[PDB]
Amino acid sequence: AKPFELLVSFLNTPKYGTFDPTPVVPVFFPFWFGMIVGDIGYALLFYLVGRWLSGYVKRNEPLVIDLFALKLKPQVIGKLVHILNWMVFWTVVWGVIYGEFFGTFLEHLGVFGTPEHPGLIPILIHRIDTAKTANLLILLSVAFGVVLVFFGLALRAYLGLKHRHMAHFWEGVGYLGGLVGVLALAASYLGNLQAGWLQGLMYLGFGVFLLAVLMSRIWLMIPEIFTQAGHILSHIRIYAVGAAGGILAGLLTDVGFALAERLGLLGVLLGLLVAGVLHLLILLLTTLGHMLQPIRLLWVEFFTKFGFYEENG
């Protein structure tokens, strides 16, 4: 649990007497990356890269990046090797439930079982069944964000109470009332209505919002409630990025299998060569493409909902 605080350390310290925000991101960030990737083959070559990095570690002498002039971390390099271990087993398990990696190997024979294609292991999720299941998966993605938003508001209320800073606590209470009201109302109106049950709780949430606002009468931040709605809605990208990556990998394996079939008896060699070359280059691009999104999300939403950009310790 310890090493991730070094990653946190790249930004400023917080004011003393406040909450220590480190331990959440050890369990959350590799979770998010695993949700993204599912590319266990990249994890394999990545593990080889980690073997090379540990080769430097026993070669304790710190390298300098030629292009970027950056002296190595080696202690912090080992901290990396640990967090790389965390993200790699997360990658492994999410790719396991996404059992096709490199793409969908079951073209020529039953590598995996599907309701359509017979195979060895009946797999759970494909990229074709997501014609139906994407809605449910996106709902899960939304719930994922609302969980961390609730954690952030709870912590902010707790610190507002501890500091005897009751104004911010009251503003948080208003945030809760408005959030639950608009969330439940949108869920009812967009989805199934069922007005006989939930209309009262929507009205109560709105009443809580307005009561907190009126006790906090002084020209407050209804636009910031709108922005925090933007914040909770912003985390949807987690599904889309991984879906695009899986679609691309499936396209690459379709290309490889078609080259294996339509190009005669000798098409397998060239198909696998081209597929490997394209796969490695697209991964070279998309790994650095994908890596920074969840840390960006954690940064902006968590530390804006939390709010710490004051006095910098």
């Binding site: 967009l190 989805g191 709108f226 922005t227 709605a229 933007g230 912003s234 902006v300 804006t304 950009y309």
Partner: protein
Amino acid sequence: GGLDRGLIAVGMGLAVGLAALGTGVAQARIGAAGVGAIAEDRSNFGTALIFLLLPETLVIFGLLIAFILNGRL
């Protein structure tokens, strides 16, 4: 067999594309200015950065309209 579904698709496509165009137009200038400000200061960091995050609500609006018109289906 109604033909309105493709109309729904093209309408939401226009909405989201126009929203993306406008927000990117914002992001270009404000990001360049933020690069200048942080490169000279580094203490205007978050203050410049939040301005980059401002126009995303314009995106999520048209996303919401697209979603409700999809849910009409």
